[PDB]
Amino acid sequence: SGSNMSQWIRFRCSKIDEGGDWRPIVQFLRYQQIEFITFLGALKSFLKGTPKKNCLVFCGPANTGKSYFGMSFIHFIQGAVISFVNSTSHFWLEPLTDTKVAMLDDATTTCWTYFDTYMRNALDGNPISIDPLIQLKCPPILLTTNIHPAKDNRWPYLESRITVFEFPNAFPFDKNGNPVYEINDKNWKCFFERTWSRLDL
Amino acid sequence: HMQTPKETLSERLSALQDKIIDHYENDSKDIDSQIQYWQLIRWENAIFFAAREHGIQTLNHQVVPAYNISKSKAHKAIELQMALQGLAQSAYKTEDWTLQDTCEELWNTEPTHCFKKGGQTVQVYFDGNKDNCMTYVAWDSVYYMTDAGTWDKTATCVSHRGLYYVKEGYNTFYIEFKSECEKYGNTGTWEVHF
């Protein structure tokens, strides 16, 4: 876009309706046994594109709703989804060339192996090349997965350069089959309006 | 209506959890707010403990944690609360004390069981290798508890050996660079950039 992160989010909030509620987001995090202050600190570093803090990971079974939660953020910020292809090339990173935040949904074991070898510059906040070889600054990347990339020491480079939040609990529904927590553009708008300064925006 | 034990525990948890998020919304700079925050967390975990004791699996849609989780988080909350209650009787009571200044994450960071403000970055390069570099924080201010139970404020000192503060006359290292070297390089050589 060219605008910085603060301008972009402020602008995105402009286009979103009033009347949301940040509470379902906070409540959903605490429901998943995640500490609010810890998460907010992680999100602050993430949006800044801080070296070694440029990849955020949500880890747990599909039924936790980690991907719904993650995708809601992408929708809010109008980020891009990238689709992993096992290669030794960066060609599949095209969609993130011009985005504020990228998402890769359901990273496999093979994906983490790829990241440990081929996404080092991106993990470090240094430019990468996709192709005449063109350099590109990698945007923050949110990944969801059910393969924890920092439990078993298989990926030593990756291991020290990602932040992982675990989602242990199934996405909760009430007695009528309605979700206990809904996470959408308006709730994200309120969330950012409440945490603006604390995110150093 | 005669309240079921689960309904009573539910009613109390819902009020506690609402209050907890109020704190997050308010972002008070008052140390007394943080003391209250950590009381709410103790109470929250006490409810989850009692819920499990009563055979309750979920409470207000929340998954009732394992006994060990409830106990660990409560013990953590008490620890922080009592540290803050002591700090509140010191000369430093009326400084800004935020959720961020008083969160568990920071508390668990070296030097542990201390409060700290104003992190200045220290870069350490192992084996002359510039790309093998660990980042540490030299805190502008460290608040520690004395043997008498009062809280004092002091600055961090940097040296080749590590990061330390003077605690009631005693140099007290919270990072040892030798130990860090013997873990990231192993030649006995390291360079400190501050």
Q: Angle at Cα A32 formed by Cα A20 and Cα A29, nearest 5°?
A: 30
| Contacts with A27 from chain B: Cβ below 8 Å | 17, 21
Nearest chain B CA: its distance from A19 CA (Å): 16
Sign of CA dihedral B12, B18, B20, B26: negative
Chain B residue closest in CA terms to A31:
B62
Q: Of B21, B62, B69, which is closest to A31 when you measure between CB atoms?
A: B62
Q: What's domain B1-106's superfamily in CATH?
A: E2 (early) protein, N terminal domain, subdomain 1 (1.10.287.30)
How many CB atoms within 10 Å of residue B169?
A: 6
Residue in the structure block whose two tokens are 């998020």: B21
| Contacts with B61 from chain A: Cβ below 8 Å | 31, 172, 174, 180
Nearest partner of A43 among A76, A11, A17, A84, judged by Cα: A76
Task: Give resolution in angstroms.
Answer: 2.1
Within chain A, what is the greatest distance between any pair of CA atoms? 58
Q: Angle at Cα A200 formed by Cα B96 and Cα A70, nearest 5°?
A: 120
Let me know: does A183 contact A60? Beta carbons within 8 Å.
no
| Contacts with B105 from chain A: Cβ below 8 Å | 35, 37-38, 41
Return the domain boundaries, chain A.
1-201
Return the domain boundaries, chain B.
1-106, 107-194
Nearest partner of A123 among A163, A168, A162, judged by Cα: A162
Q: Which fold has domain A1-201?
A: Rossmann fold (3.40.50)
Inter-chain touch A26–B21, beta carbons under 8 Å? yes
Q: How far apart are CA A53 and CA B54, in angstroms?
A: 42
b/e sequence A44-83, b meaning 16+ C-beta within 10 Å: bbbbbeeeebbbbbbbbeeebbbbbbbbbbbebbebbebe
Q: Which fold has domain B107-194?
A: Regulatory Protein E2; Chain: A; Domain 2 (2.170.200)
